[PDB]
Amino acid sequence: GLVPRGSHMYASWTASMSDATQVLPGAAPAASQSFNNQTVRHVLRLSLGGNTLRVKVSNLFGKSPITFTAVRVAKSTGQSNIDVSTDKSVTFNGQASVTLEAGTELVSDAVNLEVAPLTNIAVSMYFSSPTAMPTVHALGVQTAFIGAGNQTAATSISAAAADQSQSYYGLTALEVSSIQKTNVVVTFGDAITDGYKSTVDASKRYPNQLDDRLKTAGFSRIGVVNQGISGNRWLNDFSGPSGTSRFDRDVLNVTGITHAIILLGVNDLGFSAWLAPTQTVTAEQVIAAMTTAIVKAKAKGIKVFVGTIIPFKGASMGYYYTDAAEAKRQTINTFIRNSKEIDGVIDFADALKNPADPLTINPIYDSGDALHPNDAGYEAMAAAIDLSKLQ
Numbered sequence: 001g002l003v004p005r006g007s008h009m010y011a012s013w014t015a016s017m018s019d020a021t022q023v024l025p026g027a028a029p030a031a032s033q034s035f036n037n038q039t040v041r042h043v044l045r046l047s048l049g050g051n052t053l054r055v056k057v058s059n060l061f062g063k064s065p066i067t068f069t070a071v072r073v074a075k076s077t078g079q080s081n082i083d084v085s086t087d088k089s090v091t092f093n094g095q096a097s098v099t100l101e102a103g104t105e106l107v108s109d110a111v112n113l114e115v116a117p118l119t120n121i122a123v124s125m126y127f128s129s130p131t132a133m134p135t136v137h138a139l140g141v142q143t144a145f146i147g148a149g150n151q152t153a154a155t156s157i158s159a160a161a162a163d164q165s166q167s168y169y170g171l172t173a174l175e176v177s178s179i180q181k182t183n184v185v186v187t188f189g190d191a192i193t194d195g196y197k198s199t200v201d202a203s204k205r206y207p208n209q210l211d212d213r214l215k216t217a218g219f220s221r222i223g224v225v226n227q228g229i230s231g232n233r234w235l236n237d238f239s240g241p242s243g244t245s246r247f248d249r250d251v252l253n254v255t256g257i258t259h260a261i262i263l264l265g266v267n268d269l270g271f272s273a274w275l276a277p278t279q280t281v282t283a284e285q286v287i288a289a290m291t292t293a294i295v296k297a298k299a300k301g302i303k304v305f306v307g308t309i310i311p312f313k314g315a316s317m318g319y320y321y322t323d324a325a326e327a328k329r330q331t332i333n334t335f336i337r338n339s340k341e342i343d344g345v346i347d348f349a350d351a352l353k354n355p356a357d358p359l360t361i362n363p364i365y366d367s368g369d370a371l372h373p374n375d376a377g378y379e380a381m382a383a384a385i386d387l388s389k390l391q
């Protein structure tokens with residue numbers, strides 16, 4: 001009969017935040033991006049449609065407050081162009097401008113704009129004052145557009161092609177309302193989740209390809225949101241906050257989460273040979289971190305799936321891949337494959353391994369650095385997922 005008309009918000013797009021100024025031990029300080037009387041227009045693909053939306057902004061890693069002078073949303077028509085008749089002001093407790101203290105995030109008021117799944121919207125932010133923005137999603141695999149003055153409502157962003165970025169600045173979630181029964185699948189992980197080496201602006205990240213499979217099968221109310229961070233590790237900060245410390249924010253607290261796909265750990269193994277020799281971790285320490293995350297998510301009623309760590313022999317031999325890294329990988333994957341605690345294994349390693357040599361990525365799926373898949377590899381990852389377990 002009639003679907004009960006109680007409406008709810010659902011995460012329809014996400015990006016995990018990193019501190020752009022955070023660096024490895026012994027590394028030189030890194031500068032954050034700044035804006036000064038400038039507009040940045042982000043573009044993002046919605047997983048879930050619905051009748052109204054909310055924008056979550058972030059100063060999580062600011063060292064002092066920032067002020068969003070104006071925030072607007074519109075349907076994107078490609079590049080920096082918007083459908084101007086859909087342009088809406090984003091307000092926060094009724095205000096067009098909002099100040100976020102250092103370390104805080106904020107969900108906007110509801111915006112009355114009906115949106116459809118697998119379509120792109122533009123979220124434009126104007127910063128009138130000098131604004132340090134260390135809170136970013138570094139690897140957007142998506143062009144952002146920066147221009148002078150308040151261009152938040154402009155049809156297109158007027159500036160130089162050098163005034164482009166591929167990051168998201170203080171923009172961490174897009175939530176969309178619906179009365180329909182809805183699943184939200186959070187993909188949690190490192191660059192292989194984030195989509196490094198997938199084609200920029202082409203929505204070829206494996207979660208995008210998974211989303212495509214769901215909608216093709218008719219499941220327009222099963223959403224997939226991306227909580228990958230390129231370079232991320234379970235047990236140590238950089239790149240991005242440690243998987244253990246960000247798991248509550250980036251998985252448990254995602255609006256409407258029902259399912260999680262966890263693929264994380266290869267950087268815990270790879271970083272210790274050279275990038276961070278003081279941060280060696282055992283397979284046991286990685287398994288303990290995974291266990292605690294799994295327990296926390298199951299206690300919330302989330303279905304938890306864990307991916308096996310994909311082969312990476314050939315990845316900067318002796319400086320990322322090592323025999324020690326491989327032994328830890330095998331121990332972790334044996335633990336995953338035999339775990340009775342998780343709701344299911346997604347054997348990404350089996351889907352992507354070289355049939356000629358199981359310790360390497362299949363050459364047809366190799367972006368060329370022996371570690372990150374290409375578009376075909378990310379599509380193959382999505383094809384390896386049983387859609388019935390996301391119900």
Ligand SMILES: CC(=O)O[C@@H](C[C@@H](O)CCO)C[C@@H](O)C[C@H](O)C[C@@H](O)C[C@@H](O)CCO
Pocket residue numbers: 191230231232267274315316319320369370371
């Ligand atoms: C495969 C791959 O991606 O490896 C990446 C991973 C990072 O990008 C993090 C990704 O999350 C690190 C790798 O590039 C580091 C280099 O191997 C270091 C050597 O070049 C040092 C020697 O040259 C020194 C000679 O004295």
Ligand SMILES: [Cl-]
Pocket residue numbers: 345346347348384
């Ligand atoms: Cl599988």
